[PDB]
Design a binder for these strands. Structure first.
Lengths: 134, 183, 51, 37, 119, 171
RNA sequence: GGAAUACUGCCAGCUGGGACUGAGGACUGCGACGUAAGUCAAGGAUGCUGGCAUAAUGGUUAUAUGCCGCCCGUCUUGAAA
RNA sequence: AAGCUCGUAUCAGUUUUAUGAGGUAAAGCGAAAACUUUAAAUAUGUAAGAAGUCCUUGUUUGAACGUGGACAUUUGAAUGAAGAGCUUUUAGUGGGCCAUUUUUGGUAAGCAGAACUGGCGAUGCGGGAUGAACCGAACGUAGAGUUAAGGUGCCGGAAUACACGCUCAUCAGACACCACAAAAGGUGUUAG
RNA sequence: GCCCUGAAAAUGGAUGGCGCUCAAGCGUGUUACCUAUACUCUACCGUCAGGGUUGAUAUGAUGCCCUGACGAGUAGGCAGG
């Protein structure tokens, strides 16, 4: 029920203007929901562990869906093995940045994901737990 | 209809007609100082303001409503000439909102060609012959916004019963005079 | 941009109702009806005349 | 109260019987101590 | 006569203390003397909650779901006929319609005109 | 308003095992057809236990005057429930038609007796054919042979707001 | 016996007079008219003609007339003064 | 006010339908008003499907619980409607007037107590000569047209219109009225 | 039914006044007429709402364009200046 994000980042507004062009003219259910998460708070954009991604790849036949997080990606050394996958998000911490690439995975910004998947084909969206903080 | 009356009198009998299965109601009393019980009822009829007007498929259950709001409205049975004009001059469709004027058949067929209706007169036929899709056909139209009548009201004081020399009540046929005056 | 009312401006009437052209052709409102001689039964006359 | 037919908010009417049985026996308890002194 | 919890009952007092008198609620409590019947009641424009006990020979087990219990079974009864036939069931309850035109004969019935004659 | 006279027939609704009730018919003076049916069920409650929802109108018809030119002499029963319990009243109106007579009566009753339109039952309006059955004095007044009378003090209605003549009754 | 008229109702019947309005600005649409070409009263006004070219209209400013209009604010909610 | 947590087919100061109860008395008529069925409106509850039902036949023949399977939208009256809940937070304001409706108790007379719904406050506008509560009336800015309530002798815009009757008053009436003086008096009139 | 009586003071006074008597009274019927910020229509503003629109070259995309319905208001709450 927000229309424009509160942040006065210019670069963030660049992605906003892109997906509005996508969400109007690509009629795929993906592109809208990605855009709708861009107006969120810092609370409503919870950081996602690298391990929560590692849960996702354990699912059935989904080892090749390009997992995409709107928020930020954090590292978590509690796991040790990690797959070779394709990940795009906003922010990678240095722990998160290194562990993906050292696994052999690729780390991508969201705009290149739009280039690679305009209709959001063969992708995956996760969200972190909102009900952690009281 | 004329012939059945004529044949019965030659046969010494009496022909009654069928009961009139369609009415047209106009809100008369203003917006303020209304008890809540009728004021719920007018919102069910989309009679949101003074001199708004709509049609009712005459049932038992609908007929109890007019006994409730009788001091506030007037109604009767409309004739073909009367129905035809309100579709023409004051007809307004409703595309999701927005009180859309009719102005061409193509708007109607885009909405009710699902229900076969593709003309303007199909809709008029679905009114006066109350048909299978009357509810949607009545719900399609915007409530009719009418002006205060040209010649006036007749009576000097309105809010007495039309039988008793007032304005409100059933006026079964005489509603046809008043609507054309308000068109 | 503007609502042209029918029942005047006959061009917009012909925008609707293509039958309405032939309605004025066969004149169809000053249609005559034939007459039939059907006198009522006399009982009906009595009950009307009865006090 | 115990014989009428409604309540207006476990039975309540036997409680009304019980509280009198306090107060009836409170006469009976206060009977004894003045019988002592 | 057995009352269970959840039965829907109506009040019929077999006086002048309090008056609900024909009002309907549900049963939550049973003891041997009375039963607990709880009642909705509006105050302002909001419904309250009235726990209440009643001598059980004043309160009747209400039947109000009677026709509905029929009509679901009646629809399925007509539905069994509906698969056995190319037919629309028309299972809906309808309002009463305005009736038809018809001819009445004054043949054995001469219209007995009248006035306040007196009689 | 200028009334009309109405034959109104009702038959209260045939049920199972009761077809065809006995087609009750009244003569109603009223303005229009709506008031008459409204006036109709009103009498049908006072007479006996039928009610408006229980029955229906058979048919309604307007009664024209059989001789709307011939001057007639009318006898009228009216009873009305005032101020205490009711009482009849018989007044005679020399007039042209049936519906003409009732009009002046309602003018008369609202003149003297403050009588509402609801207040009044028209029991029966009878034409007196034969002279010397007419009983009131003032109706007998206009019946003598070769009646002549003057008009005294003939005013003339002026049109404009001035005149130059000291106008006189004419004469 | 045969007509007329009143009354009420209808006509996608014809015609006059008045007053107010002229939004919008390439084109597209629904149309009608015509054999067609094309035309039009068909998704909002154009045509023709005069005067003046300044205090003339307008503005501003005094004042007169007509009509309306009590002293604000606070506090008690009403004799609510 | 800020939000995502819903943009579902879910709801409603409403009726209908069935089921209720006050049977108020009016059917009516029974056996010799003493029926016991039954007939209305006066305001009121309850219910009206998809977690909806059956079947399968177990648990603890019924019933109270269950395993499993079948039955889709004419899917279970009318009519109107995308605004139901959530988690957070949080400004003001908690005592008061008037009217109607029942209902109980009242007396010089006013009333008093309840329950219910309006209006008022915070709200101009047309009318009622003028007015917190009377009649009308959905407050952006203008133009046109029509009306409400109330009016149309003159102030005052609108018929010194038409139509029938009644009334003369030594302080008529033009209204508060269906109340108070009020129950009557009168060789005043009019109609019964 | 109207009519008179049917007690009521003390500045000078009020059917709003003038006045009005086959009314300019009372009762009643008929049309006609007057009129509000009420309603019908159009324009305009403003809010909300629903649609469309990075394609360069040119523009503000928080923009533009189309469509609709609405607009009382103290304590207060929010936004834009």
């Amino acid at each position: 029920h927000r229309t424009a994000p509160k942040s006065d980042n210019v670069y963030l507004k660049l992605l906003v203007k892109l997906y509005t062009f996508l969400a109007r003219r690509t009629d795929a259910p993906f592109n809208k929901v990605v855009l709708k998460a861009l107006f969120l708070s810092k609370i409503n954009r919870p950081p996602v562990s690298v391990s929560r991604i590692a849960r996702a790849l354990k699912q059935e036949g989904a080892a090749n869906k390009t997992v995409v997080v709107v928020g930020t990606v954090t590292d978590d050394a509690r796991i040790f093995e990690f797959p070779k996958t394709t990940v795009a998000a906003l922010r990678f911490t240095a722990g998160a940045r290194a562990k993906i690439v050292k696994a052999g995975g690729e780390c991508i910004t969201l705009d290149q994901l739009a280039v690679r998947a305009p209709k959001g084909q063969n992708t995956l969206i996760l969200r972190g737990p909102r009900n952690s903080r009281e | 209809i004329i012939q059945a009356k004529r044949d019965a009198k030659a046969a010494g009998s009496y022909y009654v007609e069928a009961q009139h299965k369609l009415v047209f109601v106009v809100r008369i009393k203003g917006i303020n100082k209304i008890p809540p019980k009728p004021r719920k009822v007018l919102q069910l009829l989309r009679l949101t303001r003074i001199n708004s007007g709509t049609f009712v498929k005459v049932t038992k259950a609908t007929l109890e409503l007019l006994k409730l709001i009788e001091p506030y409205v007037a109604y009767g049975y409309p004739s073909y000439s009367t129905i035809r004009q309100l579709v023409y001059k004051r007809g307004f469709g409703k595309i999701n909102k927005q009180r859309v004027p009719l102005s061409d058949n193509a708007i109607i067929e885009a909405n009710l060609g699902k229900y076969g209706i593709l003309s303007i007169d199909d809709l008029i036929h679905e009114i006066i012959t109350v048909g299978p899709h009357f509810k949607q056909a009545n719900n399609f139209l915007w409530p009719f916004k009418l002006s205060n009548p040209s010649g006036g009201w007749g009576v000097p004081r309105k809010f007495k019963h039309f039988i008793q020399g007032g304005s409100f009540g059933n006026r079964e046929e005489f509603i046809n005079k008043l609507v054309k005056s308000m068109n | 941009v503007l609502k042209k009312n029918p029942l005047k401006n006959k061009q917009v009437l012909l925008r609707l109702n293509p039958y309405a052209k032939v309605f004025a052709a066969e004149k169809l409102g000053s249609k005559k009806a034939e007459k039939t001689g059907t006198k009522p039964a006399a009982v009906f006359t009595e009950t009307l005349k009865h006090d | 109260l115990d014989d009428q037919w409604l309540v207006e908010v476990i039975d309540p009417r036997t409680l009304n019987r019980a509280e009198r049985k306090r107060l009836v026996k409170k006469n009976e308890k206060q009977q004894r101590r003045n019988m002592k002194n | 006569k057995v009352y269970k919890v959840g039965d829907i009952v109506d009040i019929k007092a077999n006086m002048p203390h309090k008056f609900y008198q024909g009002k309907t609620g549900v049963v939550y409590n049973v003891t041997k003397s009375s039963v607990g019947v709880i009642i909705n009641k509006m105050v302002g424009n909001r419904y309250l909650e009235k726990r209440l006990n009643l001598r059980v020979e004043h309160i009747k087990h209400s039947k109000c779901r009677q026709e509905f219990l029929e009509r679901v079974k009646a629809n399925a009864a007509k539905r069994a006929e509906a698969k056995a036939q190319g037919v629309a069931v028309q299972l809906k309850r309808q309002p009463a319609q305005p009736r038809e035109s018809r001819i009445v004969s004054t043949e054995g019935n001469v219209p007995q005109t009248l006035a306040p004659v007196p009689y | 308003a200028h009334f009309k006279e109405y034959q109104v027939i009702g038959r209260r609704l045939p049920t199972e095992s009761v077809p065809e009730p006995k087609l009750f018919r009244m003569r109603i003076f009223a303005s229009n057809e709506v008031i008459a049916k409204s006036r109709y069920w009103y009498f049908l409650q006072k007479l006996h236990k039928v009610k408006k929802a229980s029955g229906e109108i058979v048919s309604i018809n307007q009664i024209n005057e059989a001789h709307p030119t011939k001057v007639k002499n009318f006898g009228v029963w009216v009873r009305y429930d005032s101020r205490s319990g009711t009482h009849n009243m018989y007044k005679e109106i020399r007039d042209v038609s049936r519906v003409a007579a009732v009009e002046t009566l309602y003018q008369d009753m609202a003149a003297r007796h403050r009588a509402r339109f609801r207040s009044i039952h028209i029991l029966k309006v009878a034409e007196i054919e034969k002279t010397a059955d007419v009983k009131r004095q003032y109706v007998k007044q206009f019946l003598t042979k070769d009646l002549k009378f003057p008009l005294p003090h003939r005013v003339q209605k002026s049109t404009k707001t001035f005149s130059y003549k000291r106008p006189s009754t004419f004469y």
